[PDB]
């Protein structure tokens, strides 16, 4: 009846946020390399 029996929305949102933090660090790394 109620949306989501299995509710893993919070953990999936955490995984997405950690993936975006990871993408941010790679940007900061590529930024430095491009200046070499």
């Amino acid at each position: 009846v109620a949306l989501d029996x299995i509710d893993i929305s919070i953990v999936l949102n955490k995984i997405k946020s950690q993936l975006e933090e990871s993408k941010e660090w790679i940007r900061r790394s590529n930024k430095i390399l491009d200046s070499i």
Binding site: X5, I6, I15, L19, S22, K23, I26, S29, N30, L33
Partner: protein, 48 residues
Amino acid sequence: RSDIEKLKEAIRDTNKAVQSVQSSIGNLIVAIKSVQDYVNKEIVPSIA
């Protein structure tokens, strides 16, 4: 050519390896969600 230029390109390739891992994790989320959604929509109504 230079050692510094080699170190730079080595890190560049490592960064691209990480970006591929990042994309793979985004698709792992898709796989888990597909299993979750099927169970919730097609199986859960039968047992609860």
